[PDB]
Subunit: 64 residues, 2 copies
Amino acid sequence: CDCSSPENPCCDAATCKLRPGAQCGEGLCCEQCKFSRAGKICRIARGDDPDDRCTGQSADCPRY
Amino acid sequence: ECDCSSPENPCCDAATCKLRPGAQCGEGLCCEQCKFSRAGKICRIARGDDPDDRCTGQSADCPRYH
């Protein structure tokens, strides 16, 4: 399934796959079942590291 | 807090539980030896007329194509 919970409205109940038009159902870079905009900051870094940012292409917040 | 779900994962420094030097990931269909898979690698086979899902080259998840 594309959603770990059957309560999640981002997935069609009948198939447990993403509902029509949906790109995601969870993650720091998921907003109303769509990918966050590319470059949205999703993890604050410390020391001299760059902040992590959303890809536009995925719902996880990857290491930059 | 941590970059790996399990302390056994060698992709993370044991002392900090953050990604070891040079690592980009520790898990996921688009993670290969603690590095992101190449952009466009197929990571989920689709059916009917759907495009297959592909790795981004900048994340370790396998996202829905768009």
